Write an enzyme that holds these catalytic residues in place. Sequence first.
Site, PDB file in Angstrom:
ATOM      1  N   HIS B  65      -6.500  10.311  -5.627  1.00 48.25           N
ATOM      2  CA  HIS B  65      -6.632   8.901  -5.262  1.00 48.25           C
ATOM      3  C   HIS B  65      -5.996   8.570  -3.914  1.00 48.25           C
ATOM      4  O   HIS B  65      -6.207   7.474  -3.389  1.00 48.25           O
ATOM      5  CB  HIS B  65      -6.170   7.957  -6.385  1.00 48.25           C
ATOM      6  N   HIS B  90       2.215   7.623   1.445  1.00 49.62           N
ATOM      7  CA  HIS B  90       0.780   7.881   1.226  1.00 49.62           C
ATOM      8  C   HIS B  90      -0.081   6.862   1.968  1.00 49.62           C
ATOM      9  O   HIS B  90       0.442   5.974   2.653  1.00 49.62           O
ATOM     10  CB  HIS B  90       0.448   7.880  -0.266  1.00 49.62           C
ATOM     11  N   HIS B  92      -3.996   4.528   2.550  1.00 53.44           N
ATOM     12  CA  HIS B  92      -5.183   3.844   2.055  1.00 53.44           C
ATOM     13  C   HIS B  92      -6.139   3.520   3.215  1.00 53.44           C
ATOM     14  O   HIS B  92      -5.703   3.166   4.318  1.00 53.44           O
ATOM     15  CB  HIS B  92      -4.813   2.518   1.352  1.00 53.44           C
ATOM     16  N   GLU B  96      -5.028  -2.176   2.289  1.00 50.42           N
ATOM     17  CA  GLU B  96      -4.909  -2.941   1.045  1.00 50.42           C
ATOM     18  C   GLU B  96      -4.562  -4.402   1.340  1.00 50.42           C
ATOM     19  O   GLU B  96      -5.226  -5.311   0.852  1.00 50.42           O
ATOM     20  CB  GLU B  96      -3.863  -2.307   0.132  1.00 50.42           C
ATOM     21  N   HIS B 109       1.883   3.497   3.115  1.00 52.80           N
ATOM     22  CA  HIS B 109       2.936   2.997   2.212  1.00 52.80           C
ATOM     23  C   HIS B 109       4.075   3.985   2.059  1.00 52.80           C
ATOM     24  O   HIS B 109       3.847   5.151   1.705  1.00 52.80           O
ATOM     25  CB  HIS B 109       2.366   2.685   0.828  1.00 52.80           C
ATOM     26  N   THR B 176       0.176  -1.118  -6.444  1.00 53.54           N
ATOM     27  CA  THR B 176      -1.264  -1.410  -6.273  1.00 53.54           C
ATOM     28  C   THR B 176      -2.186  -0.448  -7.059  1.00 53.54           C
ATOM     29  O   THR B 176      -3.410  -0.520  -6.919  1.00 53.54           O
ATOM     30  CB  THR B 176      -1.703  -1.428  -4.792  1.00 53.54           C
ATOM     31  N   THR B 177      -1.604   0.467  -7.832  1.00 53.78           N
ATOM     32  CA  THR B 177      -2.374   1.317  -8.753  1.00 53.78           C
ATOM     33  C   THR B 177      -1.840   1.153 -10.175  1.00 53.78           C
ATOM     34  O   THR B 177      -0.657   0.833 -10.348  1.00 53.78           O
ATOM     35  CB  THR B 177      -2.325   2.816  -8.359  1.00 53.78           C
TER      36      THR B 177
END
Lengths: 225, 225, 225, 225
Positions: B65, B90, B92, B96, B109, B176-177
């Site tokens: 992910h 990590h 995105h 986000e 993040h 956020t997950t």
Amino acid sequence: GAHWGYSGSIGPEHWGDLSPEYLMCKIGKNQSPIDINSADAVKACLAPVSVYYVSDAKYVVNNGHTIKVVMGGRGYVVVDGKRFYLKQFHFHAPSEHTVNGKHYPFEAHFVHLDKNGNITVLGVFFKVGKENPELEKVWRVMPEEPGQKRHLTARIDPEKLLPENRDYYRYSGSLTTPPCSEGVRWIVFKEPVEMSREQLEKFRKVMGFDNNRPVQPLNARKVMK
Amino acid sequence: GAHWGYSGSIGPEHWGDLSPEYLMCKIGKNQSPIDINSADAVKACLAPVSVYYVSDAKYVVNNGHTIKVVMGGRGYVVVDGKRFYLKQFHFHAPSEHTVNGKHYPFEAHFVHLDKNGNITVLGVFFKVGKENPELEKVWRVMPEEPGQKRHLTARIDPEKLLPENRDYYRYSGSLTTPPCSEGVRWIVFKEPVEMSREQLEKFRKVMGFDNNRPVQPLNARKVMK
Amino acid sequence: GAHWGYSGSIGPEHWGDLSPEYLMCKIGKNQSPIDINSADAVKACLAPVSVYYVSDAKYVVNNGHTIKVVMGGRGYVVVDGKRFYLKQFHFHAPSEHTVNGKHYPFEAHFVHLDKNGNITVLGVFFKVGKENPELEKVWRVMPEEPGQKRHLTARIDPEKLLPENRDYYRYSGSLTTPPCSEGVRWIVFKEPVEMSREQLEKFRKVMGFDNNRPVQPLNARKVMK
Amino acid sequence: GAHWGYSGSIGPEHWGDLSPEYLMCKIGKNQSPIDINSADAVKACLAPVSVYYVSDAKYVVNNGHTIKVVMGGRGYVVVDGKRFYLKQFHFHAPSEHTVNGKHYPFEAHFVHLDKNGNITVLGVFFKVGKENPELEKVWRVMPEEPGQKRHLTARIDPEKLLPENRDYYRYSGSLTTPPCSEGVRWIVFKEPVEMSREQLEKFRKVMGFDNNRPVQPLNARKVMK
Ligand SMILES: CC(=O)Nc1nnc(S(N)(=O)=O)s1
Ligand SMILES: CC(=O)Nc1nnc(S(N)(=O)=O)s1
Ligand SMILES: CC(=O)Nc1nnc(S(N)(=O)=O)s1
Ligand SMILES: CC(=O)Nc1nnc(S(N)(=O)=O)s1
Ligand SMILES: [Cl-]
Ligand SMILES: [Cl-]
Ligand SMILES: [Cl-]
Ligand SMILES: [Cl-]
Ligand SMILES: [Cl-]
Ligand SMILES: [Cl-]
Ligand SMILES: [Cl-]
Ligand SMILES: [Cl-]
Ligand SMILES: [Zn+2]
Ligand SMILES: [Zn+2]
Ligand SMILES: [Zn+2]
Ligand SMILES: [Zn+2]
């Protein structure tokens, strides 16, 4: 929702276990009330909270957990550019919020809903001092037993219950009674107002128990000041 | 916990229904990410967030992910006078968080835990410009398939990924997950840093899909700026 | 007042000695322009400066120390709850104010008086970039010799010369040309606007010399941001 | 410099005419004291003013316009990251500064110089209440006639005269006695301290007259709070 109270097996520490509906009491990280440490609060460019109240108090009710004045709902305050309509106001002794770890003897909550049902509560601290003339109009007809309602013939002006200085603390929290729903805007005025020793003692006599939820951890939140 | 993704029947609008463990996705009122409307944010006396990072990266992993660099946990930032230790960072794409309703193409993040397990995430926006030298160290050894881990050939200096200007937005939110736990401190730096188009395209190619959760309603919260 | 200029025996370092009328140049502790160190400025809850300009530009004049657009004086800005009327705007190259020790190549000053003759100057920085369409209307009829005036047939909208972002630095200072009177409100916009290289070079050609007063010590003052 | 006083032909409205040296009284636009209107003051991210005072009082003097305790100059406060050394403190009745148009009965000034001779004055308001123990040490040995100096029998701890709450108003101003030089940093603490009616009356009796300069116009300045 299940029966709840302020002591025994149904007291605040157990609320989260009384009903699946009350889960936020147990799992919430944004709960109210809180201790407001003034040094830890962030100095911020907060907007004035404008007050547009009307004298539409209908009745007073003793619901077994507070004394509540029910309004017609036409008066409002402006928060985040939106109108939040005053539905009711009610009382706690001792204060639910603390400031630097200290309680006030009494706290009033003015509960407002915007057109989409979002909640804003305005908090007013009271200290023992001179008799409060506006409060006395309500106190004169205070319903003494749970379940009793009393019509107001006197015209209550709720604006007269707020402090003259309108500086406030703001934070994001919850209702302080089950189901303790979050997404509630809290506006807590910094300056207390006065009530007489006699007014305080009548409320405490009628209630028969302290009705404040214990303070909850700030967690990730900051209070603005 | 139950399997989840970024699209279809296991996508973000369904996360709250995939597992009782994921309930906050459905009922939370303090969720992340959010749109940061700069005019609605409250100008506030925010403390500098001091950074004391160390070069203790262990490996990079493609976890299905995101692409994540796992750290030793010795470096830290100071937030609310406390040390929050850097565990991992990590990525995105697209971003986000949004700013005034607009995405950046990419967001990093940096995930930190204090000694009691409280979480702070620092967010860094990226725009397309020149190749990012520090990012390139990780990109050179990017694990191409979910489940793969690679050793880091160059020394990672995580502070070199942060913008030079350290002004930030702050709010209280969530992961956020799933399970999207709340009580998370968010520090989102205002100034973006740069990456090349090629760096962004390699990430999107390896991932095979957009991996941003949709923005969530602010509800009662304010963002400080 | 005595003759003054930007170099030689009548240059800025000598202004205080040219006339008893110019004494504040010599003895003033609240002089302009200044270097604006952004870290040293105090973050503050400054009010928006609302702009209510009208297109009443009458003529352009070359007075030998600047190029000035003279207005009818009906447009105004609101500062400290009062109307300050736009009387004229004019230009300096390079910038008079600096930011973190750096000049912009050009600075415009919009000079306003309230009903009691109190002065507010709005400062706009320019950088080299795209041709400025509103500025071009003035530049097209720029009077090339000192003493020359040129009527404006084109309709100048002075609001179109301000940056779109209205964030500003504020401090208390002085006029930047003799007699350098104090009690002047300075509003310096943070965001620069663009002019073309050609527009900058025409102004510099017509002037024939740099027309910025050297920066002056802050002394007891703070800049708000 | 020329003789001056608080009334008659040599009073404050005439100071600017008594001597060319006193010109700033007449022409200054950044003069002290001022009325501090709390609503007009700008909420700002002001740094704490740290106090590092020592017990190095040398003597007390009645100088004909105040009662002044002269210090050794080793103690200091930190303002704008710099050390301002405490040289002396003295007193005025009624207060020189006003707050929302109202005087306090008494005001103390702590006068500091940095290594380059820049001046910072800390101001402390007094209200009538309980006898002030630290003030009493000085009051016991108050020189009764102009020109007299007395040794201090008790050890003076000047920090004990400051309020416990260290929040303050800040502005740029001047000395409040001729020559009324500008470029002075003013730090005026918001919280008053207490003195007895008897302490105030002894001061007024020994002085024989009010010794406050009238408040001066703010002009272009803002007060930060
Ligand atoms: C029906 C209703 O108003 N419920 C409330 N529960 N707690 C409230 S409080 N103490 O947070 O204002 S209001
Ligand atoms: C294991 C772990 O760190 N989980 C996270 N889930 N979401 C995160 S984020 N995108 O909010 O930074 S971190
Ligand atoms: C007549 C007039 O406007 N005089 C000025 N002198 N200096 C000014 S400036 N550069 O401070 O805006 S305006
Ligand atoms: C010698 C000396 O200190 N002179 C002063 N004059 N006025 C002062 S005050 N009232 O502004 O603190 S101090
Ligand atoms: Cl209630
Ligand atoms: Cl009644
Ligand atoms: Cl992750
Ligand atoms: Cl590093
Ligand atoms: Cl001019
Ligand atoms: Cl024209
Ligand atoms: Cl003195
Ligand atoms: Cl001391
Ligand atoms: Zn309540
Ligand atoms: Zn993430
Ligand atoms: Zn100018
Ligand atoms: Zn004084």
